[PDB]
Design a protein around this ligand. Structure first.
Ligand SMILES: CCCC[C@H](CN(O)C=O)C(=O)[C@@H](NC(=O)Nc1ccc(C)cn1)C(C)C
Ligand SMILES: [Zn+2]
Length: 185
């Protein structure tokens, strides 16, 4: 069972490397890793388990964040109210197209690997199309908009050694770009 002790923190070299593409099929160990990544997210969202193991609640996890420099991510976004929910373990995910129009969470973003909150808007594409493999090497193509698009972009960033605060404007951290879409958490 993964817990916070498995999450490496900002400053660790692995978070700034470019993660390696997976060979398909995955090894048993790689499959177990990705399953445990998803399981971390599940536990972090269970009030009781999270309390018992001091888990910070999360909706996304990238393998580099547990010091595994591989292009695997997990995303677990529970139902918001619209009936839409996201439960994906992706191998070699790639953004193949996206909107010109941007979006941002009005609070900025946070990160499991980052202890202190960083104020500032993180502009991302409002819509994206992702191609990936699943855990069994089958094909997945996702069309995502708004909140889940933001989360996936955040996770994919980790695989290229990019941190959310890299996107924050130094001089005007809280000024939205013209026409950018405010996304409700
Ligand atoms: C936008 C990218 C977020 C990635 C980041 C983990 N990460 O470091 C990933 O690489 C999170 O998951 C944030 N926490 C979060 O979202 N908590 C949350 C929010 C809503 C619901 C319903 C439950 N839990 C962090 C601020 C911890
Ligand atoms: Zn993160």
């Amino acid at each position: 069972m993964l817990t916070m002790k498995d999450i490496i923190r900002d400053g660790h070299p692995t978070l700034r490397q470019k993660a390696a593409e997976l060979e398909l099929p995955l090894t048993k160990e790689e499959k177990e890793t990705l399953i445990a990544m998803r399981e971390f997210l599940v536990n972090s969202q269970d009030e009781e388990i999270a309390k018992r193991y001091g888990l910070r609640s999360g909706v996304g996890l990238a393998a580099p964040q547990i010091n595994i420099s591989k292009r695997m991510i997990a995303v677990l976004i529970p139902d918001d109210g619209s009936g839409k929910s996201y439960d994906y373990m992706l191998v070699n995910p790639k953004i193949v197209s996206h909107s010109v129009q941007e979006a941002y969470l009005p609070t900025g973003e946070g990160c499991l690997s980052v202890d202190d909150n960083v104020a500032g808007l993180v502009h991302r594409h409002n819509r994206i199309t992702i191609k990936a493999k699943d855990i069994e090497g089958n094909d997945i193509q996702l069309r995502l908009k708004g909140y889940p698009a933001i989360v996936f972009q955040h996770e994919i960033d980790h695989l290229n050694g990019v941190m959310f605060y890299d996107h924050i404007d130094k001089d005007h951290p809280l000024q939205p770009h013209t026409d950018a879409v405010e996304v409700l958490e």
